[PDB]
Amino acid sequence: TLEQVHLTEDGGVVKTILRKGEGGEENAPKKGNEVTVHYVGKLESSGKVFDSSRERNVPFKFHLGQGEVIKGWDICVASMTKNEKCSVRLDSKYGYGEEGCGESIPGNSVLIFEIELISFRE
């Protein structure tokens, strides 16, 4: 019943909106903007959480579209609007690829992130 939006043509970044954000230009973030989000990241296969800003109780901030984050994140957040909450499924291409990252992210891992866009600014 919830729509799944394919943000790439290879099925590699698939976003499901769990809560719609606010409409209007003033509510969609722009390339380079500092975006403030909460996220929980888990492996698709095991469901094991590898990283969470919610566990930190500190909103995470990055500069949109500049490669400060994995590519699936730049693509997913570019599609979001203020207050939007989503679950995105990232193929390893859009994640940490063949080699993974640390113990908690094996090579060739599909990652599932719940991401809430809290605010942004220039």
Ligand X SMILES: O=C(NNC(=O)[C@]12C[C@H]3C[C@H](C[C@H](C3)C1)C2)c1ccncc1
Residue 63's binding partner among a second copy, ligand X, none (Cβ under 5 to 8 angstroms by kind) is: a second copy
Nearer of residues 36 and 87 to a second copy, judged by Cβ? 36
Residue 69: contacted member of ligand X, a second copy, none (CB under 5 to 8 Å, by partner type):
ligand X
The DSSP letter of residue 122 is: -
| Of residues 28 and 88, the one with the C-beta less far from ligand X | 88
Q: Can you read off the two tokens belonging to residue 11?
A: 């099925």
- 43 alpha carbon, distance to own chain's centre: 13
Burial per residue of 3-36, b for 16 or more beta-carbon CB atoms within 10 angstroms, e otherwise: eeeeeeeeebbbbebeeebeeeeebbbeeebebb
CA neighbor of 80 nearest in space, from 42, 41, 39:
39
Q: Looking at 50, 73, 96, 113, which residue binds a second copy (CB under 8 A)? A: 96
Q: Which of 73, 76, 109, 120 binds ligand X (CB under 6 A)?
A: 73
User: Does residue 22 belong to the site contacting a second copy (CB under 8 A)?
Assistant: no
Report the partner that residue 73 touches, choosing among ligand X, a second copy, none (CB closer than 5 to 8 A by kind): ligand X
SS3 breakdown of the chain: % helix, strand, coil, rounded to 5? Answer: 15, 40, 45
Interacting residues toward ligand X by CB under 6 A:
39, 41, 51, 60, 69-70, 73, 101-102, 105
Catalytic residues: 39, 50-51, 70, 96, 113
